[PDB]
Design a protein around this ligand. Structure first.
Ligand code: NI
Length: 254
């Protein structure tokens, strides 16, 4: 059955995540000097297939005190999502999204169903489910067909059930005030940041600023090949107070 302790769950999720994301292990040490770092959030992904849907993943958190705190729809990416909050403010928010499989070609829908058909339903209630990885055989052509319509779908097909990212709470870092200053320390320590949308996405005026490392790389063992792909980035977020004084809790620019 599922974890009973919130600290143990995140410990196990992080141990799994850093295997894909060595940069996160290094930056965690850099910023915290060996102390634990407060996280703003983690992000998990799935498909809207009953066996593995948003609600199934969410039970791993609502069973140990998380509360449903926000509903989101992302139209362009064909996603719905929710975030969950724990009564202890040291604990990360939990962001869980699911791809709407019906929005894709019949061929992609069949392929995605084919992967999830291989998931043992019993695995979905075990304690390791959210960091259990791949439960399916998948070949390169299947990966490419998914990738042609959805990077999200391809990522889930390649890596399975594992954290997509952890996000450091800049608010809570005792030595830093500004995301720009965290970004500068990261570059000075020899990490490279994603600079596509600009190195900082958002602004104080939209109540949220985020930045990230460039994704590390991992080898995925497809049925017909061993392919190197991007795994995960490590993210950084500063939140700002709304009109009423509480921090903005959303996940894109307000
Ligand atoms: Ni995030």
């Amino acid at each position: 059955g599922m974890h009973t302790d919130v600290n143990a769950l995140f410990a196990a999720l992080w141990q799994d995540y850093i295997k894909m994301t060595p940069s996160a292990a290094k930056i965690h040490q850099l910023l915290g000097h060996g102390a634990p770092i407060i996280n703003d959030h983690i992000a998990l992904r799935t498909f809207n297939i009953a066996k593995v849907n948003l609600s199934v993943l969410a039970k791993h958190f609502t069973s140990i005190g998380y509360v449903d705190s926000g509903d989101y729809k992302f139209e362009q990416k064909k996603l719905i999502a929710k975030h969950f909050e724990h009564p202890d403010p040291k604990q990360p928010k939990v962001f869980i999204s699911e791809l709407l499989v019906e929005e894709f070609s019949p061929e992609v829908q069949k392929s995605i169903h084919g992967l999830i058909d291989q998931v043992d339903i019993a695995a979905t209630t075990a304690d390791n489910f959210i960091y259990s990885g791949r439960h399916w055989d998948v070949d390169k052509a299947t990966y490419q067909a998914l990738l042609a319509e959805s990077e999200y779908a391809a990522w889930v097909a390649a890596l399975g059930y594992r954290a997509n990212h952890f996000t450091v709470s800049i608010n809570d870092l005792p030595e830093f005030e500004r995301i720009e200053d965290v970004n500068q320390a990261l570059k000075q320590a020899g990490f490279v940041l994603n600079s596509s949308g600009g190195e900082v996405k958002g602004s104080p005026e939209v109540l949220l600023e985020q930045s990230s490392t460039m994704a590390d790389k991992v080898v995925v063992n497809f049925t017909d090949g061993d392919v190197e792909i991007p795994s995960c980035f490590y993210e950084f977020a500063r939140r700002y107070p709304m009109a009423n004084g509480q921090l903005y809790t959303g996940f894109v620019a307000a």
